[PDB]
Design an enzyme around this catalytic site. Structure first.
Site, PDB file in Angstrom:
ATOM      1  N   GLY A   1     -14.641  26.007  46.322  1.00 51.89           N
ATOM      2  CA  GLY A   1     -15.078  24.635  46.471  1.00 51.89           C
ATOM      3  C   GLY A   1     -16.581  24.581  46.654  1.00 51.89           C
TER       4      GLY A   1
ATOM      5  NE  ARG B   1      -5.755   9.029  55.620  1.00 51.79           N
ATOM      6  CZ  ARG B   1      -6.586   7.994  55.715  1.00 51.79           C
ATOM      7  NH1 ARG B   1      -7.513   7.785  54.793  1.00 51.79           N
ATOM      8  NH2 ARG B   1      -6.497   7.167  56.747  1.00 51.79           N
TER       9      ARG B   1
ATOM     10  NE  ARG C   1      -1.655  10.102  59.753  1.00 52.82           N
ATOM     11  CZ  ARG C   1      -1.326  10.134  61.042  1.00 52.82           C
ATOM     12  NH1 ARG C   1      -0.101  10.492  61.408  1.00 52.82           N
ATOM     13  NH2 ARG C   1      -2.218   9.803  61.966  1.00 52.82           N
TER      14      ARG C   1
ATOM     15  CG  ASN D   1      -5.931  17.896  49.896  1.00 57.82           C
ATOM     16  OD1 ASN D   1      -6.153  17.315  48.836  1.00 57.82           O
ATOM     17  ND2 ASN D   1      -6.729  17.789  50.949  1.00 57.82           N
TER      18      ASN D   1
ATOM     19  CB  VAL E   1     -12.290  24.163  55.319  1.00 56.80           C
ATOM     20  CG1 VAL E   1     -13.050  22.970  55.907  1.00 56.80           C
ATOM     21  CG2 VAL E   1     -12.901  25.469  55.804  1.00 56.80           C
TER      22      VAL E   1
ATOM     23  CG  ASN F   1      -8.818  17.865  56.682  1.00 59.27           C
ATOM     24  OD1 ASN F   1      -9.705  17.052  56.936  1.00 59.27           O
ATOM     25  ND2 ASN F   1      -8.707  19.029  57.319  1.00 59.27           N
TER      26      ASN F   1
ATOM     27  CG  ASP G   1     -11.522  18.356  66.529  1.00 59.79           C
ATOM     28  OD1 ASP G   1     -11.998  17.404  65.873  1.00 59.79           O
ATOM     29  OD2 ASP G   1     -10.464  18.944  66.228  1.00 59.79           O
TER      30      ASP G   1
ATOM     31  NE  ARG H   1     -17.548  15.046  64.194  1.00 62.81           N
ATOM     32  CZ  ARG H   1     -16.708  15.398  63.234  1.00 62.81           C
ATOM     33  NH1 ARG H   1     -15.472  15.779  63.534  1.00 62.81           N
ATOM     34  NH2 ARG H   1     -17.113  15.381  61.976  1.00 62.81           N
TER      35      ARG H   1
ATOM     36  CG  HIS I   1      -8.766  17.179  62.806  1.00 67.30           C
ATOM     37  ND1 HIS I   1      -9.761  17.623  63.650  1.00 67.30           N
ATOM     38  CD2 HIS I   1      -8.842  17.952  61.697  1.00 67.30           C
ATOM     39  CE1 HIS I   1     -10.413  18.620  63.076  1.00 67.30           C
ATOM     40  NE2 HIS I   1      -9.874  18.838  61.889  1.00 67.30           N
TER      41      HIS I   1
HETATM   42  N1  LIG Z   1     -11.333  21.282  58.934  1.00 73.30           N
HETATM   43  C1  LIG Z   1     -12.032  20.079  59.248  1.00 73.30           C
HETATM   44  O1  LIG Z   1     -12.061  19.642  60.389  1.00 73.30           O
HETATM   45  C2  LIG Z   1     -12.691  19.458  58.021  1.00 73.30           C
HETATM   46  C3  LIG Z   1     -14.017  18.826  58.208  1.00 73.30           C
HETATM   47  C4  LIG Z   1     -14.547  18.275  57.013  1.00 73.30           C
HETATM   48  C5  LIG Z   1     -13.948  18.297  55.805  1.00 73.30           C
HETATM   49  N2  LIG Z   1     -12.647  18.940  55.721  1.00 73.30           N
HETATM   50  C6  LIG Z   1     -11.958  18.973  54.369  1.00 73.30           C
HETATM   51  O2  LIG Z   1     -12.669  19.966  53.515  1.00 73.30           O
HETATM   52  C7  LIG Z   1     -12.499  19.651  52.049  1.00 73.30           C
HETATM   53  C8  LIG Z   1     -13.808  19.605  51.307  1.00 73.30           C
HETATM   54  O3  LIG Z   1     -14.728  18.654  51.978  1.00 73.30           O
HETATM   55  P1  LIG Z   1     -16.034  18.305  51.069  1.00 73.30           P
HETATM   56  O4  LIG Z   1     -16.805  17.364  51.914  1.00 73.30           O
HETATM   57  O5  LIG Z   1     -16.753  19.561  50.657  1.00 73.30           O
HETATM   58  O6  LIG Z   1     -15.582  17.596  49.757  1.00 73.30           O
HETATM   59  P2  LIG Z   1     -15.959  17.389  48.270  1.00 73.30           P
HETATM   60  O7  LIG Z   1     -15.063  16.415  47.635  1.00 73.30           O
HETATM   61  O8  LIG Z   1     -17.480  17.194  48.232  1.00 73.30           O
HETATM   62  O9  LIG Z   1     -15.794  18.875  47.660  1.00 73.30           O
HETATM   63  C9  LIG Z   1     -14.484  19.444  47.304  1.00 73.30           C
HETATM   64  C10 LIG Z   1     -14.770  20.400  46.173  1.00 73.30           C
HETATM   65  O10 LIG Z   1     -13.430  20.965  45.816  1.00 73.30           O
HETATM   66  C11 LIG Z   1     -13.448  21.166  44.422  1.00 73.30           C
HETATM   67  N3  LIG Z   1     -12.068  21.234  44.013  1.00 73.30           N
HETATM   68  C12 LIG Z   1     -11.022  20.356  43.873  1.00 73.30           C
HETATM   69  N4  LIG Z   1      -9.871  20.866  43.451  1.00 73.30           N
HETATM   70  C13 LIG Z   1     -10.108  22.173  43.285  1.00 73.30           C
HETATM   71  C14 LIG Z   1      -9.221  23.297  42.829  1.00 73.30           C
HETATM   72  N5  LIG Z   1      -7.967  23.149  42.497  1.00 73.30           N
HETATM   73  N6  LIG Z   1      -9.894  24.489  42.809  1.00 73.30           N
HETATM   74  C15 LIG Z   1     -11.171  24.774  43.123  1.00 73.30           C
HETATM   75  N7  LIG Z   1     -12.055  23.745  43.559  1.00 73.30           N
HETATM   76  C16 LIG Z   1     -11.464  22.465  43.619  1.00 73.30           C
HETATM   77  C17 LIG Z   1     -14.185  19.942  43.794  1.00 73.30           C
HETATM   78  O11 LIG Z   1     -14.479  20.048  42.487  1.00 73.30           O
HETATM   79  C18 LIG Z   1     -15.246  19.739  44.832  1.00 73.30           C
HETATM   80  O12 LIG Z   1     -16.544  20.397  44.439  1.00 73.30           O
HETATM   81  C19 LIG Z   1     -11.645  18.343  52.108  1.00 73.30           C
HETATM   82  O13 LIG Z   1     -10.245  18.676  51.927  1.00 73.30           O
HETATM   83  C20 LIG Z   1     -11.904  17.699  53.485  1.00 73.30           C
HETATM   84  O14 LIG Z   1     -10.975  16.742  53.931  1.00 73.30           O
HETATM   85  C21 LIG Z   1     -12.045  19.506  56.826  1.00 73.30           C
END
Ligand SMILES: NC(=O)c1ccc[n+]([C@@H]2O[C@H](COP(=O)([O-])OP(=O)(O)OC[C@H]3O[C@@H](n4cnc5c(N)ncnc54)[C@H](O)[C@@H]3O)[C@@H](O)[C@H]2O)c1
Ligand SMILES: NC(=O)c1ccc[n+]([C@@H]2O[C@H](COP(=O)([O-])OP(=O)(O)OC[C@H]3O[C@@H](n4cnc5c(N)ncnc54)[C@H](O)[C@@H]3O)[C@@H](O)[C@H]2O)c1
Ligand SMILES: NC(=O)c1ccc[n+]([C@@H]2O[C@H](COP(=O)([O-])OP(=O)(O)OC[C@H]3O[C@@H](n4cnc5c(N)ncnc54)[C@H](O)[C@@H]3O)[C@@H](O)[C@H]2O)c1
Ligand SMILES: NC(=O)c1ccc[n+]([C@@H]2O[C@H](COP(=O)([O-])OP(=O)(O)OC[C@H]3O[C@@H](n4cnc5c(N)ncnc54)[C@H](O)[C@@H]3O)[C@@H](O)[C@H]2O)c1
Lengths: 305, 295, 296, 305
Positions: D7, D81, D87, D94, D117, D119, D147, D150, D174
């Site tokens: 990602g 989301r 949900r 995902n 990471v 969700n 968390d 923060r 969360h």
């Molecule tokens: N763990 C936590 O507390 C926490 C905090 C923040 C964000 N997150 C989660 O982390 C993820 C990413 O957040 P983000 O802000 O970078 O988002 P984003 O949308 O900017 O980036 C996601 C990336 O995933 C890639 N992607 C999608 N499907 C894919 C697949 N099958 N294979 C490979 N790559 C793929 C996209 O092309 C994109 O570049 C989300 O699921 C978000 O909800 C979790």
């Protein structure tokens, strides 16, 4: 990554501490012949980890068994050179020290990378090498980085520019054996001869030549250790993080600069496998002459052993 | 930012060097009464800059004129109560002749007492004169717990009030691993030893060294304090400061949690100590108080 | 030390975050014309503090009152390109000066050389206090390519780059080295030419990959290096966009040349001995930068 | 040490960059499905090494072959989301993403530690785990650190103290599933209940609960990535440097807290082998109930997958 530092004196301890803090190894063993000192310093270092934010396991010892399987071994054993000492006197003494230490670490550590700091550097690095039984690429000495460092700081005081933007090319050994290559000594890529008078440069070169003696003259007893330790760590860092830094170190040549086998200070690429490449720069006639001449002198002294 | 370190011995030089590479000050001056040592150590440090990647101007000196207008002054000068008191007295009167309003951090033993001496000599508000001790004790307490439980020292909090040794007052209820009180993780018997080892921590190093004392942890501890002040972090650290009633102790300098900022002590914390710990703390305060009286 | 970053986009935010962690300022203000963006990014940054171990007070805002008395102000605001961004840099600068009396302004908004000039005249500040980031980034790229070619650490490579971006860029080969050794000593003329060209088109190479927007990680790191020299008064010698007064046979025009960065900004302008081709290239560009400025 | 980041979005890229600069790996691979972005961002990162002072080889790719033999794999793929997603909807989307990725990385890496990471975290970590086929000790999720981070920043603003001297104990997941343990939440070792009124504490806990939403509320589009990235790196660091940090992470339990095989957020010791210890803290009846309760919710969602 496990690292052993032989010798718990000013240079060894300062080096161990810096290494611990940079977390360049999870295990760091500080060994010395004198009981107490290594145990004390190592504990003092570890106890600073809560504040330094590192969990490097730093322990002190007097048993080479504790150094078993070290990936890198730093030899700082010996003693500077009490005022009035003879060249040949120190040579014999330290040759013994380095030999004893080297045989001991090879008894508990196979294939490590050995970094020598003991004086006379070039010869001692040779000694360590022969006793280690490892390829020359795994045994290296620290000298040039330190000379380059002093040279750079002097150039910095002269022009009022950051030391980070100054490159000092220094080959060979220390004293008359030092071969500073003014040609590749730059400030932001500009040769210092483009910026400073030959007369000023000569002074900077000579201060670099006797840079250690300058510290000694102030401390009254002992000798420099912050710059030497920092220099040792820069090399250790390139090896641990496989950065491929190009630093002037004491390495066994095999033809470059018309020199063979003898350990001479030259620019080399340092990686996880030690000396990964030796650079043969285009030195001017005089410099190349001094370099071959000094290496010959080393060759002699190495026979005296 | 100009910092002056008094005493070019083991703690002072180690401190200056750490200070130099952390680039917490543009100008750093190492001063000592002995000629050459500071000039030599400072040059060695400065020459390390090309490699440590710092340009801090570190200079050694024997002339207080070189310490003029210092923002922070660290006093590590010393060889006991009587001798170091004279030393700390002499040093303080000298720095004040060239620096009108610095923040003074005292490390010279006996700490709490020396901190008080520097304070009275300086004529500065007590918020600008503090001593290092608690941070070091806490650090030791922390490394031992780390050895006992096999966890990172960064996730261990050790509460330590009072002076060194017998006068030291580690607060077990406020000593934790990831927020979990240690009494929840270790047998009260092991906690007692860890505590005792912390009380005699300084002697443990001395015994090993045979000559001199510890300096790597002490130096690191001092720098953490300097950093909170320089970067105005508002760290909460136990240091020796003048009390005005907190803990039922007045006037006397004692190790207590304080909020360190660019203005020095910006807040003194009064934590709820049980009868046993409050008694000790007060007991020690009176000891520190008698000595200051006789001085 | 109070630093304000104008433009909470890819470069501005990345820069602010790096600044926050390095603890180069007690206060860091992220301002943008778009509501919410800076507040959100600044909050996200601040919440990283418990982990990055910094207490830098980073706040977002849409109100220039929050940028009051800033020691250093970084302008990354920008979306013909000459006219539009010139309008933005103009508006931003005039606003900056209504609340900060004497900051050091570092311009990043393209077209750099020109925007730096715009910011300078609007600020009414001495030219030593207004500089643009450009050379450091080009040099970083030139250095990364050499490292790929020779397999050496980038820390031991010095790339000399003067002038502006693109065909206005003047990479000086004889002052580009590896451990003090001229690259011409280590690489074939052809290989050197390709590396020089890849450096010229460095920015477009990233854009082509991203489709939307441009590079920001190297640009941000480059800006921070400049900020650090000033904040820590390091006296680094870095190629930045600055107003010349005769050096290189160029006057008034803003162009990239090596300068000594200190607490007072540009404390020295370095005039290195360029060969005929490079000196003319540099002068040619400067004249172009000069025409655009005249039209604005 | 080779590390792969699946990602190249805001959290993936920000994490890659931080990892590169800290030199925690000599090789860092950034993979994504969209052609271009990973190559571009990765090249931009590497081109900053001359200034950042690191030589980490950062490369971008769309080919899982490049992730071959990664020591650690970070999954940040997805796009959760939207301004009105279900949900359920997010869970299915995902869930397919995490499985498609996990299966892909296992074909080029045999024994890598996987850090999730994506969700909903607890659930996605379970998914990744089942597909990977690795022991639960090598598959963990990032949530508690964020968390906790923060929570600490809020306590810092409230008391005006450094965030470094604040500990925040946060278990579970969360939002509603978050289980902050006020009892073990301190400032220099002092429980915050000793310092702040229950009313202020509750406000701090709820802001922590909806911390992600607060960011979203300002950015209008997307979500938080700096704090999340920093949190992921702190875990990665403990593993790489074998620091043995104790951090709240999402791991497969096996009894503790009266919870069996489900992934729940609890304090664990992280070392080079992954989850080296699960700490069962003395929660109060209410918190213990919330934990098991939410854990059930997770079991129900994993079942219909
Ligand atoms: N763990 C936590 O507390 C926490 C905090 C923040 C964000 N997150 C989660 O982390 C993820 C990413 O957040 P983000 O802000 O970078 O988002 P984003 O949308 O900017 O980036 C996601 C990336 O995933 C890639 N992607 C999608 N499907 C894919 C697949 N099958 N294979 C490979 N790559 C793929 C996209 O092309 C994109 O570049 C989300 O699921 C978000 O909800 C979790
Ligand atoms: N490479 C350079 O350019 C450079 C720079 C500085 C110092 N040096 C040299 O490095 C050495 C150390 O310098 P220092 O200032 O740290 O000295 P030092 O006297 O403080 O420390 C040397 C340590 O070696 C120990 N030692 C002696 N014999 C030993 C043996 N057989 N085995 C194990 N330990 C033994 C001592 O007990 C002592 O603790 C000296 O020989 C000095 O000349 C070289
Ligand atoms: N606060 C703590 O927890 C703590 C921890 C360690 C050491 N200490 C104390 O710190 C002091 C220094 O420890 P050290 O290991 O660095 O000692 P040291 O013996 O290595 O160095 C002391 C230095 O003070 C210098 N000095 C003496 N009188 C002076 C004067 N009048 N003016 C200026 N300089 C003078 C000496 O010449 C010497 O270089 C000692 O008093 C020691 O007990 C306190
Ligand atoms: N100097 C260099 O070598 C270099 C390197 C990279 C980018 N740049 C330039 O820097 C600028 C920013 O790049 P980016 O990638 O961060 O862009 P971006 O589009 O991500 O962000 C630009 C930000 O500017 C803000 N903005 C627009 N008008 C504004 C105004 N009047 N006031 C305040 N904020 C305003 C936007 O709302 C946006 O958040 C561009 O002009 C780009 O070409 C220069």
């Amino acid at each position: 990554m496990k690292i052993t530092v032989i010798g718990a004196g000013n240079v060894g301890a300062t080096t161990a501490f810096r290494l611990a803090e940079k977390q360049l190894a999870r295990e760091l063993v500080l060994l010395d012949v004198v009981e107490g000192i290594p145990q004390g310093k190592a504990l003092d270092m570890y106890e600073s980890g809560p504040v330094g934010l590192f969990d490097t396991k730093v322990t002190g010892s007097n048993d080479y068994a504790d150094t078993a399987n070290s990936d890198i071994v730093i030899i700082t054993a010996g003693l500077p050179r009490k005022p009035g000492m003879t060249r040949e006197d120190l040579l014999m003494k330290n040759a013994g020290i380095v030999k004893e230490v080297t045989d001991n670490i090879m008894k508990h550590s196979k294939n490590p990378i050995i970094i020598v700091v003991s004086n006379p550097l070039d010869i001692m690095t040779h000694v360590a090498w022969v006793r280690s039984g490892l390829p020359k690429e795994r045994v290296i000495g620290m000298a040039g980085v330190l000379d380059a460092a002093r040279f750079r700081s002097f150039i910095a005081m002269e022009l009022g520019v950051s030391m980070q933007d100054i490159n000092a090319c220094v080959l060979g050994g220390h004293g008359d054996a030092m071969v500073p290559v003014v040609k590749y000594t730059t400030v932001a890529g500009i040769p210092i001869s483009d910026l400073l008078p030959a007369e000023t440069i000569d002074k900077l070169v000579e201060r670099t030549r006797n840079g250690g003696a300058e510290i000694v003259e102030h401390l009254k007893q002992g000798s420099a250790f912050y710059a030497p330790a920092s220099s040792v760590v820069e090399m250790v860092e390139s090896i641990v993080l496989d950065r491929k830094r190009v630093l002037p170190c004491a390495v066994g040549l095999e033809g470059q600069y018309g020199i063979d086998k003898t350990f001479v200070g030259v620019p080399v690429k340092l990686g996880r496998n030690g000396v990964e490449q030796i650079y043969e720069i285009n030195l001017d006639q005089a410099d190349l002459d001094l370099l071959q001449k000094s290496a010959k002198i080393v060759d002699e002294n190495c026979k005296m052993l």
